[PDB]
Ligand binder design. Structure first.
Ligand SMILES: Nc1ncnc2c1ncn2[C@@H]1O[C@H](COP(=O)(O)OP(=O)(O)OP(=O)(O)O)[C@@H](O)[C@H]1O
Ligand SMILES: Cc1cc(F)ccc1-c1ccc(C[NH3+])cc1Cl
Ligand SMILES: Cc1cc(F)ccc1-c1ccc(C[NH3+])cc1Cl
Ligand SMILES: Cc1cc(F)ccc1-c1ccc(C[NH3+])cc1Cl
Length: 327
């Protein structure tokens, strides 16, 4: 059977905090007044919620309302508890209130509003300096939540709001976040396909905070190499093959052998044998302005099969790639 794994950092956080901190099923929700909020426009809808721009009529300030779709009550209580635990943390979205929507008959989470700059505009115009700057801001959010015993598990550009005019970044959508408990087996059906860590793709359930660092590396690779997404799988199986065409199959076998994981035999028809590639192979005249030896070294330390070998968020903050960023 699989060899167990533990995070190399923040293993004891949920042990030394009181049970009320992580026992989200026991949490009693403090309900606000739904009449304080007036929905202005629908911003979007996903499989878990409908999101609206709204106005808080007690102070005329813009807010964002996330009306939850009915799903297992445990998922709703977990997101609320995580948001309350992390409130006030660097670059963590602020949960302002929780109200009962009269129409949906479900909880509606009210958040601070972020004037989110167009994503296409950010992807197309962020400079080398801006990418370093915002990556450092995301690392502040991730080290904070990991230090608080929480893994986000859905790190991707759509979950990072940036108000570029005010150089303000917030990490949002904590609906897939979980408390990290050493030895716990987690559901591998988390994160969006292109951001899924190899641990999810090989069905290794005893993962930890380091899953977020893989997803962060996928974001950085796409951004600096101008290749959206960087690992472009047609499905979850082809997703691992796309990773193996860059990182190589020999290091993939070293990883699964270390943890006594067997690949699904369906990989025999599609995986093949691939050498590890040098990161310089992805550099060309249209992305060279965003690449540096420091960017490649940093990327190499995030995009590693072995989840225990990746840089932690706090180690990543010390990396030479961020020396140019004004602190
Ligand atoms: N706090 C927030 N500020 C701005 N937009 C948000 C916020 N939370 C979620 N969204 C938006 O909700 C939508 C998710 O569907 C996206 O359009 C995303 O930009
Ligand atoms: C979209 C959805 C799906 C459901 F199964 C139940 C409720 C809802 C829902 C209904 C109305 C609104 C607006 N208050 C929002 C939602 Cl999530
Ligand atoms: C600032 C950044 C840096 C990256 F390396 C990769 C992606 C992004 C990014 C691009 C657009 C958005 C807007 N939702 C957010 C982010 Cl984090
Ligand atoms: C030529 C090279 C080789 C590497 F191994 C890593 C980075 C670089 C490099 C150095 C400077 C720049 C300018 N922004 C770009 C690159 Cl790819």
């Amino acid at each position: 059977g699989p060899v167990p794994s533990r995070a190399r950092v923040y293993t004891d956080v949920n042990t030394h905090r009181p049970s009320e901190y992580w026992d989200y099923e026991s949490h009693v929700v403090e309900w606000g007044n739904q009449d304080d909020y007036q929905l202005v426009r629908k911003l979007g809808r996903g499989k878990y919620s409908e999101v609206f721009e709204a106005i808080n009529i007690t102070n005329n300030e813009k807010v964002v309302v996330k009306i939850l779709k009915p799903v297992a009550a445990a998922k709703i209580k977990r997101e609320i508890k995580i948001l309350e635990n992390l409130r006030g943390g660097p670059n963590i979205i602020t949960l302002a209130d929780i109200v009962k929507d009269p129409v949906s008959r479900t909880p509606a989470l009210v958040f601070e509003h972020v004037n989110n700059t167009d994503f296409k505009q950010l992807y197309q115009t962020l400079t080398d300096y801006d990418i370093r700057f915002y990556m450092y801001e995301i690392l502040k959010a991730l080290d904070y939540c990991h230090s608080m015993g929480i893994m986000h598990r859905d790190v991707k550009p759509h979950n990072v709001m940036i108000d570029h005019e005010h150089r303000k970044l917030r990490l949002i959508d904590w609906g897939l976040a979980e408390f990290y408990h050493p030895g716990q087996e987690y559901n591998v059906r988390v994160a969006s396909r292109y951001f899924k860590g190899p641990e999810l793709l090989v069905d290794y359930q005893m993962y930890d905070y380091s899953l977020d660092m893989w997803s962060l590396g996928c974001m950085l690779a796409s951004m600096i190499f101008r290749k959206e997404p960087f690992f472009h799988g047609h499905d979850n199986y082809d997703q691992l093959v796309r990773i193996a065409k860059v990182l190589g199959t020999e290091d993939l076998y070293d990883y699964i052998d270390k943890y006594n994981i067997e690949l699904d035999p369906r990989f025999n028809d599609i995986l093949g044998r691939h050498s590890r590639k040098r990161w310089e192979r992805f550099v060309h005249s249209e992305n060279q302005h965003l690449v540096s030896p420091e960017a490649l070294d940093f990327l190499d330390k995030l995009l590693r099969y072995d989840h225990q070998s990746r840089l932690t968020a706090r180690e990543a903050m010390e990396h030479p790639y961020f020396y140019t960023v004004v602190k």
